[PDB]
């Protein structure tokens, strides 16, 4: 792991000491190589997980998030290359440094053994995101968005610190291997239900729940792009990972402190997908879809079954890839029209007949297409929920219907129709922004060809 | 001021607290506090304007009463036990009166009403000394008597300082008052733990000084005293926004910066004694302490404000003011968390 | 060794440097009255140095290579555009006015840095104590909106009392037709198209306001054209002045020291001019301001502090 | 829900509460008379708390 | 008004360097950026990693 996060640190001098004309290239290529060397930790020939030190470990839940975080960086970096091309070189390099800092801190999170390491890094991730959203957003609502996105997190996370501190004072170590093998059943009192809530309602904010999600549209809609990629791809999964790690020390309270959150997730998933059915803003449509997806992950982690954790991991990775892809696809048009309004430009597939295939595949990923790690996750958590209660499929099916609807409606009212003939500024395409979608989709196909990796702790 | 006078006055300022530390008699302790009092007023009142006169009068009149109350506590102890030291088996009323007067000296809530006023009434220097060096001897008194203090008002005052500093700094456009309310909040964090491992009180003190001194220097470099004046810094001296940002985000304690260590370890040692919900309240109002720092650093570093035509002259000319210690103190803040076990 | 308390203690005081002609002396007047021709000869005869009228470009000349810069760095103002379009919506008028006040202010500061450092006297012309004249002229016409007057007078209020006034002022008067015909015989298409009420209001401002309030602190030497010619007579009047009635008499070495320190730092000098009072005639927006600042730090001699520019020819840069 | 009521309940209630507390708290006037009266009130409360708790 | 610059209008690229790829203005840098991306991303990562 050290061999993954030291080169990631060396990517920063590589930015600052290189020419202005040979800085995107070098850092992009070397980031791809970091992604390559982040495959050694998929060499798990055994059941025992990979401990490299007291600091760092890597389980089959860590490794996909690690690899995806190392893999997104070149994509963020190339997507961020048309805008801030007319920016001063120092400003460019500051953007690069923030993205690399995100990479490093997120790898450290997913590789951490203790919960306090994970805490300080889970919170250090806020500073790059806030800077990216605020200094490089295009609109004026970015400031309120940053405030929301920061303070929801901090409100949720201060109780988390208090609970971790309590657990240290009670057990002594706060390490995840030892909390696994030494976990006392809880006495089922209010003093422990508050502990459950303090441990959970930091991650549940970040995933997010439907009661608390207003930070995610305001941020996705206003972050330039790369912030949106990350905020859709791994910052939401940074809560699911934490829940999967911390739930082991909360049994048996999860059997009854989970009803409200499963229920909120399910109903609010339906609510969010219905919103996606009727939404003027494309970058908000993607965001509400992300809420409607992560709600299933919430319910799944609450059920704590093998099928459920499995499907949660699958849906995590799949949603991350396809959501980053859809944000790229919307940015591709926003870099020309400079409008997020979707019904503005609605008759493409004449000018962009190849991007319109990436659109289609991105949507089919989004809706439940079977030979895909999206439907595998959605199906397995549907099966877990049916085992839990047979009356949940009534809601999952409504979601499936609406999720076909808003995705196909997006495709239709953006591509299909009559071309907006008043748009002379529809430049043909960028090889860069075609390679982007290819690099988002080719992993989906590969992982569908081999989902033995993309499962989690339980398979 | 001629040099003889500056020598005398700064020697007196340095010797007030130094007498306060290296003294077992509480009366020479009082003497040191009074040297700190006497010698500060000339430099508070140096620019000779009504604001300075008001600041100096408020400072003097608030500190004299606290001094008399401390002397009362000392004389009552001398009557009780025939000694010049707060032993055990002293009266809690004596000790609590001492605590009250020391809180009035520091600037803690509900004795906080004078600190932001006085600080606005004086230059950036004499805010630095007032907020950093004058806090060290009054804290030394409490540190020397930490197992004798009542653990109840010590925490109520801390909680009031936290809440009121946060709420006051929420709405202050003036920076010289933001620094004051920050002082109030951080003294609250200190005083809360002072009966519990007072090494951490000195830790928070050193961290707070190391953060505030370079911030005051940043304000000094262009004589910035307002959000709108610090906002014209992407034009005048734009190489400072990085350090200003990280220092503000250390002040409002965020993890990767070392300004989170004092709050974190304070919460630790407070949960080690079942002081749980108080620490929860404190940690949840530190967020509001962070909010106005975030607003400020938006205003100066992320959303560059309009500037003027006459600010190009500043670009023509050159500067010499950064004392080479701003760098060291700003980098030893904001980047020294991984060395925290060597700090504790 | 940069000057400071250590130097003053070592013995680099000021009162040792003043001999007789250690004098801030300003020559004032209207648009074309014979100020430079007179100030130059005063400086020659008495042993001072001439400090010409601070225009749009004094900072540029006293900084860097000492050349004129493009007009967007040395302000955003043109005097020609003021004469050919004095009631623009684009606030060229007050932008110019405030830029010139700041330039006169830096000029006076450089002057005092020279005087107290060396004891050598200084001849100025139309200092910061006589710049409000043109503002009042503009405001009596419709060339300024009144908020700009408040801005100017506030900056004056903040900047003026810190500095000492001149010892004597030399206001040479000319009637308005005489100066108007002199402008006609000057050879400028733009100064030619100036009114007569503008000049008469300049004259009224001078004679009413600037003369008595400076006679309360300075030695006025009102002359006319036939007296302004032959500088030697004006010089021979200056030689025999009793320099009483002012705040220079109550100055110690340490007052001079703190003035010398305020004046050695041009940023403290100009701080109160860069205030964020948001007048549309003075604000320049973030995008334009950033473009200007970048393009200014991408010039020869700029982009770093003075000695640290190897593209110019500086050396020992890795050892400074 | 999302654009009015989830905004009015969770975030905007917080904002209004904290800013209203700020207003009624920090709208003080620079008079040492009133500050010192409050200091006296604090003296009284501390001595009463001592006499009661004991 | 407050003396800001106006909006720079819609840039078109393919006027200059109609073989533009998406990376930079210099035609050499675009080529040696796309070759870098394609090589290091497809030919080594997506092949040897598989």
């Amino acid at each position: 792991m050290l061999k993954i996060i030291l080169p990631s640190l060396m990517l920063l001098p590589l930015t600052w000491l290189s020419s202005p004309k040979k800085t995107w290239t070098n850092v992009t290529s070397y980031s791809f190589l970091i992604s390559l060397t982040s495959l050694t930790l998929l060499w798990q020939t055994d059941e025992n997980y990979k401990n490299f030190s007291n600091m760092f470990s890597s389980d089959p839940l860590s490794t996909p998030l690690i690899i995806l975080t190392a893999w997104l960086l070149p994509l963020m970096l190339m997507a961020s290359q048309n805008h801030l091309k007319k920016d001063n070189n120092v400003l460019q390099k500051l953007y690069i440094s923030m993205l690399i800092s995100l990479q490093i801190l997120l790898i450290m999170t997913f590789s951490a053994t203790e919960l306090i390491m994970f805490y300080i890094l889970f919170e250090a991730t806020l500073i790059p995101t806030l800077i990216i959203i605020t200094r490089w957003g295009n609109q004026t609502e970015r400031l309120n968005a940053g405030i929301y996105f920061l303070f929801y997190t901090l409100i949720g996370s201060i109780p988390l610190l208090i609970a971790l501190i309590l657990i240290q004072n009670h057990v002594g170590t706060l390490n995840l291997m030892i909390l696994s093998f030494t976990t006392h059943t809880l006495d089922a009192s209010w003093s422990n239900n508050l502990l459950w809530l303090a441990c959970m309602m930091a991650f549940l904010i970040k995933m997010p729940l439907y009661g608390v999600h207003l930070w995610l549209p305001k941020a996705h809609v206003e972050a330039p792009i790369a912030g949106s990629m990350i905020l859709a791809a791994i910052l939401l999964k940074l809560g699911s990972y934490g829940m999967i790690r911390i739930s082991i020390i909360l049994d048996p309270l999860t059997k009854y402190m989970a009803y409200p959150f499963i229920l909120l997730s399910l109903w609010g998933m339906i609510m969010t997908s219905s919103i996606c059915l009727r939404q003027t803003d494309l970058k908000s449509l993607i965001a509400y879809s992300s809420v409607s997806h992560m709600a299933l992950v919430i319910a799944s982690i609450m059920i704590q079954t093998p099928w459920s954790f499995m499907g949660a991991t699958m849906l995590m990775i799949a949603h991350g890839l396809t959501s980053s892809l859809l944000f790229c696809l919307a940015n591709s048009n926003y870099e020309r029209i400079h409008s997020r309004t979707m019904i503005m430009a609605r008759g493409l597939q004449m000018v962009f007949p190849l991007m319109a295939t990436w659109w289609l595949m991105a949507s089919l990923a989004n809706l439940a297409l079977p030979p895909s790690i999206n439907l595998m996750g959605e199906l397995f958590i549907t099966m877990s929920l049916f085992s839990w209660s047979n009356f949940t499929i009534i809601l999952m099916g409504i979601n499936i219907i609406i999720t076909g609807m808003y995705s196909m409606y997006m495709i239709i009212t953006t591509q299909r129709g009559k071309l907006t003939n008043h748009m002379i500024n529809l430049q043909p395409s960028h090889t860069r922004e075609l390679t982007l979608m290819a690099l988002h989709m080719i992993p989906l196909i590969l992982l569908t060809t081999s989902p033995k990796l993309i499962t989690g702790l339980t398979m | 001021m001629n040099p003889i006078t500056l020598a005398i006055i700064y020697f007196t300022i340095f010797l007030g607290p130094v007498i306060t530390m290296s003294s077992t008699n509480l009366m020479l302790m009082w003497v040191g506090l009074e040297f700190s009092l006497l010698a500060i007023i000339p430099m508070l009142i140096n620019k000779k304007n009504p604001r300075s006169t008001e600041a100096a009068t408020k400072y003097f009149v608030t500190q004299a009463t606290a001094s008399m109350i401390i002397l009362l506590a000392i004389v009552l102890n001398y009557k009780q036990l025939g000694t010049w030291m707060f032993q055990q088996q002293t009266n809690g009323l004596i000790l609590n009166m001492t605590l009250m007067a020391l809180s009035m000296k520091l600037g803690l809530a509900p004795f906080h009403f004078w600190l932001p006023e006085v600080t606005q009434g004086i230059p950036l220097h004499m805010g630095l000394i007032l907020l950093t060096w004058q806090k060290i001897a009054p804290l030394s008194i409490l540190i020397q008597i930490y197992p004798l203090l009542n653990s109840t008002i010590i925490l109520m005052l801390a909680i009031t300082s936290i809440f009121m500093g946060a709420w006051g700094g929420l709405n202050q456009t003036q920076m010289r008052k933001i620094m004051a309310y920050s002082s109030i909040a951080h003294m609250g964090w200190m005083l809360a733990i002072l009966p519990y491992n007072p090494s951490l009180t000195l830790l928070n003190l050193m961290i707070y000084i190391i953060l505030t001194a370079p911030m005051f220097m940043a304000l000094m470099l262009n004589n910035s005293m307002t959000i709108n004046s610090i906002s014209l810094l992407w034009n005048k001296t734009p190489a400072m926004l990085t350090m200003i940002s990280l220092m503000l985000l250390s002040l409002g304690g965020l993890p990767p910066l070392t300004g989170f260590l004092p709050k974190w370890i304070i919460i630790t040692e407070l949960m080690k004694n079942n002081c749980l919900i108080m620490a929860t309240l404190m940690a949840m109002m530190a967020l509001l302490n962070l909010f106005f720092y975030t607003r400020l650093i938006y205003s100066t570093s992320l959303t560059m404000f309009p500037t003027n035509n006459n600010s190009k002259m500043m670009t023509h000319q050159t500067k010499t003011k950064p004392n080479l210690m701003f760098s060291t103190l700003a980098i030893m803040s904001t980047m020294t968390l991984p060395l925290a076990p060597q700090l504790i | 060794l940069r000057y400071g308390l250590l130097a003053a203690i070592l013995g680099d005081k000021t009162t040792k440097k003043l001999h007789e002609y250690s004098r801030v002396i300003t020559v004032d007047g209207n648009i074309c009255s014979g100020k430079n021709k007179l100030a130059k000869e005063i400086a020659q005869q008495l042993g001072m140095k001439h400090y010409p009228e601070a225009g749009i470009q004094y900072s540029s000349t006293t900084t860097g290579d000492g050349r004129p810069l493009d007009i967007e760095f040395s302000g955003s103002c043109s005097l020609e555009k003021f004469y050919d379009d004095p009631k623009s919506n684009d606030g060229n008028s007050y932008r110019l006015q405030s830029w010139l006040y700041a330039s006169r202010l830096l000029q006076y500061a450089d002057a005092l840095e020279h005087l107290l450092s060396t004891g050598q006297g200084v001849v100025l012309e139309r200092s910061i104590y006589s710049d409000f004249v043109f503002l009042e002229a503009m405001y009596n016409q419709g060339y300024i909106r009144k908020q700009c007057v408040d801005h100017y007078n506030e900056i004056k209020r903040l900047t003026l009392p810190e500095y000492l006034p001149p010892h004597a002022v030399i206001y040479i008067d000319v009637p308005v037709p005489e100066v108007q015909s002199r402008i006609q015989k000057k050879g400028d298409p733009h100064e030619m198209k100036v009114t007569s009420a503008y000049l008469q209001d300049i004259e009224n401002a001078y004679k009413k306001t600037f003369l008595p309030k400076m006679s309360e602190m300075c030695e006025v030497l009102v002359y006319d054209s036939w007296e302004a010619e032959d500088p030697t007579k004006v010089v021979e009047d200056i030689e025999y002045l009793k320099y009483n009635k002012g705040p220079w008499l109550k100055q110690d070495d340490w007052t001079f020291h703190y003035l010398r320190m305020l004046v050695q730092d041009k940023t403290e000098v100009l701080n109160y001019t860069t205030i964020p009072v948001y007048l549309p005639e003075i604000t320049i927006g973030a995008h334009q301001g950033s473009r200007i600042y970048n393009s200014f730090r991408e010039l020869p001699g700029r982009k770093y502090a003075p000695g640290y520019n190897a593209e110019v020819g500086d050396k020992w840069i890795w050892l400074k | 829900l999302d654009l009015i009521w989830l905004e009015k309940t969770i975030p905007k209630s917080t904002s209004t509460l904290h800013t209203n507390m700020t207003t009624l708290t920090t709208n003080q006037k620079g008079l040492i008379k009133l500050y010192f009266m409050s200091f006296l009130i604090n003296i009284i409360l501390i001595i009463i708390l001592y006499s009661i708790n004991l | 008004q407050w003396q800001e610059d106006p909006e720079p209008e819609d840039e078109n690229v393919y006027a200059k360097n109609p073989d533009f790829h998406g990376y930079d203005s210099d035609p050499v840098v675009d080529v040696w950026n796309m070759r870098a991306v394609f090589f290091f991303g497809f030919s080594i990562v997506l092949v040897f990693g598989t």
């Binding site: 490089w136 957003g137 295009n138 609109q139 004026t140 400079h338 | 929420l170 709405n171 202050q172 456009t173 003036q174 307002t226 959000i227 709108n228 906002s231 205003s299 959303t303 560059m304 404000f305 309009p306 | 964020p276 948001y278 549309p280 604000t283 927006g285 973030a286 995008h287 | 920090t26 709208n27 | 407050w2 909006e7 720079p8 819609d10």
Partner: peptide
């Protein structure tokens, strides 16, 4: 099209002494 930076109406709210 262009990145938004503040204007005078956004700056004037930070000049009232109490906010």
């Amino acid at each position: 099209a262009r990145q938004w930076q503040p204007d005078i109406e956004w700056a004037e709210q930070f000049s009232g002494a109490v906010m």
